[PDB]
Structures are given as C-alpha cells and as structure tokens.
C-alpha cells in the first residue's frame, strides 16, 4: 500500500533527521556565544520538542544554521504527522467501504 | 465502525497515559535538583500541556526518564488527533458519498 | 593505556611560531571534541580553543588574543594547534583534552610546556 | 560569558575534617558544571560530572552538589593526597569557561 510505503518511510525519515538534527544543531551552535544547544544528548531531546512541536523553550538554536536545522526538523516531524493521518484516514476510509459491502 | 473504535480506543489510552504519565513524571524528576515537574497536581497539568502540544513553557521534565515520558505522553496525545481527524474524514467522506446516492 | 599523546616540550623564539600535536587513541567517535587549555605557571586553566576532527570545524576563545589555529590529521587521529608570533606572555603548559560532546573533559594529555625565549 | 567564582582561594584544613569548594555561576546553569583536581606538576583529573555525578576510579569520599549558581564539591575525611588544585567548569553556555580553582591546605 502507497499510504503504509509513505508513512513508514517519513517515519524512518523521521528518525534519521532526528540524529542529524542533533547532530548538526550542535555543530552549528557551537561557535556562538549564549548558545546552549551546544551538548549531543540534549539536542537529540530538543529534535524531538520541535518535530513535535511541544513549544518549551528550555533550548532553541541562536544561529542561522541552527535555524535551518530546525526547520528541517518541524517539516519532517510535520511532513510526517500529515502522511500519518492521510494513511489512517485511507485505511479508515478503505475499510468503511467494505463494510458498506460498495 | 473501524474508525470510531480506533478513535474512542486512542482517548481512553490518551487519558491513562495523561494519568500514568503525571505518576511516571514526578518520579523520573524527583531526585534530579532544579526539577519543577515534582508534584502531581502540576504534573497532570504539564500532561495536558504536552499532549496537546501547547507549548507554555513553565514545566518541562530535566531528565532523560522524564523526557522520555514526555514523549510517550506527546506520541499518545498526536496519534489519538490523527486517528480523530482521519475518523472524521471517514465519516464525512462516507456520508457526503450517500448525500450523492453512490 | 595513555589516551592523549603531547610532547614533553618545546622552546620557541620570540616572533616564531610552533605547531604542537595530541595524538589519541582509545574508543574514538565521530561526535569527539579535542580541546585546548593553556596554563600559565602558577596559575590557572585558560579554555583556548576546540575542533571536531572527523569535520575540521573549529571554534576558539574569541575573549583572548587570537594565538591559536586548530587542525586535526583523521587518519593519524593526531590534534594539531599551530600557535603563531608567540611573546613571553605565550610561555606556558599546553594541555589537550578530549570532550565526547557532553560538556567534559574525560581525558587529558600530559601537557606541552612551551618556552619562548631566545 | 558565564564566569565562575571560586571561594575561598585557599581553603585549609584538618586531616579527617569534611571539607567543602564553592562554585557560583553569574547565571543560573542547571546542574551543567564539572570538577577537576590537578595535583602539582600533574594534568587536571576529573573528579565529579554534572553537580553530583561520580566517576569510576575516584575515591566515594568526594561528592558534589548544587544546581542553577551554586555548587559545591565536598570530600568527607580529607587526607594528604587529597591536596591539590580544584577546578570548576560549566558546559552550559557557549564558551566552556573554567573557575579560578582552590587550593586544599592540610
């Protein structure tokens, strides 16, 4: 099924900009004075609050390519969020219709 | 309905895992100096908060239990809006499709 | 077995210039930090300047004169800091430390004490 | 640039006394904030990661403590080779800076 293909690979997709996210953030931050994004461990948890969107504030990216990190991250978390609903609502929508005997 | 099962399954599993994850929260926190997310009252609301992706700011987990927790408790909160969402979607698609007779 | 490798010395001429080197060895990743610290004798640790090898990027102390310029050797997995027009004020222990970005320092190198006179 | 202040400069001591180095952070740092012991003519050796976090191969009488600007490492039954240098160092903020250490006296 396309929807299952997409979804699973946005989801591997997801995971890989995560590492890297983490990755890169740190090595993009580092250099800039008042960054605190500046750890492995703690922007791998800072990927996850922003592909997620959860909006705490305890650490963000200070510089233009720590942005641009981060907005990798929020598109590929919401990239994959919208390929999520868009499967289930398929899969839903699929199986409904069969159960309308149509 | 599929759908509807999917749905109601998700908001009582988003409940226990609101529930669970206040308890979890301030026992992953507490021990940890500085940690706020340290008693249950605020923890459930921090829950809410998380779930819903709200993004205030004002109580946030220090540690790596508690921001794991965070993140079953962000993952329950976007998977029971998608599986809403898509239910929605298959609802309305299958009763616009008998407005039209088909 | 010694993680981090340094020189026991190095006397240098005021004006000149010297390139020292850390070799490390030990459980190696991609995500290693080597640091510089120099320490004036009778005095304290003085943060000078990082490099992350396995992608050359370098950042430095930008709150003192700019001595320092960091390189790193991948396959010999050698740190080098090229300290250039070096004056009495530059005479100290030069120590490498490896950081496994997670803020400290694990391990160190015995040190390089760099002499500068004539 | 976060500075860390070192009290006292020297700090002395009886041999067995708990003995106790104090780290204050311009600004609040969480608990990101490292100890180091350089014993003379040796390199630094670090001693406690993160406020309280102990490493392997370092005696159990040190400890540590404190979070957002105040730290302290503490060592119960101070003995001679216990006299040395103790640095701090945060890794909250960019750039890492170090404290300007204490001296142990017996």
């Known amino acids: 099924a396309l929807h299952w293909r997409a979804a699973g690979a946005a989801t591997v997709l997801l995971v890989i900009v995560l590492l890297a996210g983490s990755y890169l953030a740190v090595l993009a931050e580092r250099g800039a004075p008042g960054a605190q994004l500046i750890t492995y461990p703690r922007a791998l948890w800072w990927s996850v609050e922003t592909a997620t969107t959860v909006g705490y504030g305890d650490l963000y990216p200070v510089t233009l390519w720590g942005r641009c990190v981060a907005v990798v991250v929020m598109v590929a978390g919401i990239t994959s969020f919208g390929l999520v609903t868009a499967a289930l609502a398929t899969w839903f929508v699929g199986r409904e219709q069969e159960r309308r005997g149509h | 309905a599929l759908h509807w099962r999917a749905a109601g399954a998700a908001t009582v599993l988003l409940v226990i895992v609101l529930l669970a994850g206040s308890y979890l929260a301030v026992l992953a926190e507490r021990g940890a100096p500085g940690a706020q997310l340290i008693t249950y009252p605020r923890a459930l609301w921090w829950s809410v908060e998380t779930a819903t992706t709200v993004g205030y700011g004002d109580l946030y987990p220090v540690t790596l239990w508690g921001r794991c927790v965070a993140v079953v408790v962000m993952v329950a909160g976007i998977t029971s809006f998608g599986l809403v969402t898509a239910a929605l979607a298959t609802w309305f698609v299958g009763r616009e499709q008998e407005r039209r007779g088909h | 077995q010694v993680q981090l490798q340094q020189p026991g010395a190095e006397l240098v001429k005021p004006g000149a210039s010297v390139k020292l080197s850390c070799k490390a060895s030990?459980?190696?990743?991609?995500?290693?930090?080597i640091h510089w610290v120099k320490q004036r004798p009778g005095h304290g640790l003085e943060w000078i300047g990082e490099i992350i090898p396995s992608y050359g990027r370098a950042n430095y102390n930008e709150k003192i004169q700019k001595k320092a310029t960091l390189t790193a050797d991948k396959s010999s997995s050698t740190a080098f800091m090229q300290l250039s027009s070096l004056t009495s004020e530059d005479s100290a222990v030069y120590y490498c430390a490896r950081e496994r970005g997670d803020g400290y320092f694990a391990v160190w190198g015995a040190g390089t004490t760099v002499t500068v006179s004539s | 640039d976060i500075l860390l202040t070192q009290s006292p400069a020297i700090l002395s001591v009886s041999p067995g006394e708990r003995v106790s180095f104090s780290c204050r952070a311009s600004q609040s740092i969480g608990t990101d904030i490292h100890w180091y012991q350089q014993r003379t003519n040796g390199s630094p050796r670090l001693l406690i990661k993160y406020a309280s976090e102990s490493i392997s191969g370092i005696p159990s009488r040190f400890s540590g403590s404190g979070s957002g600007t105040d730290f302290t490492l503490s060592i119960n039954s101070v003995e001679s080779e216990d006299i040395a240098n103790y640095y701090c160092?945060?890794?909250?903020?960019?750039?890492?800076?170090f404290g300007s250490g204490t001296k142990l006296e017996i």
């Open positions: 160092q945060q890794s909250n903020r960019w750039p890492f800076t």
């Open positions: 030990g459980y190696t990743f991609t995500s290693d930090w």
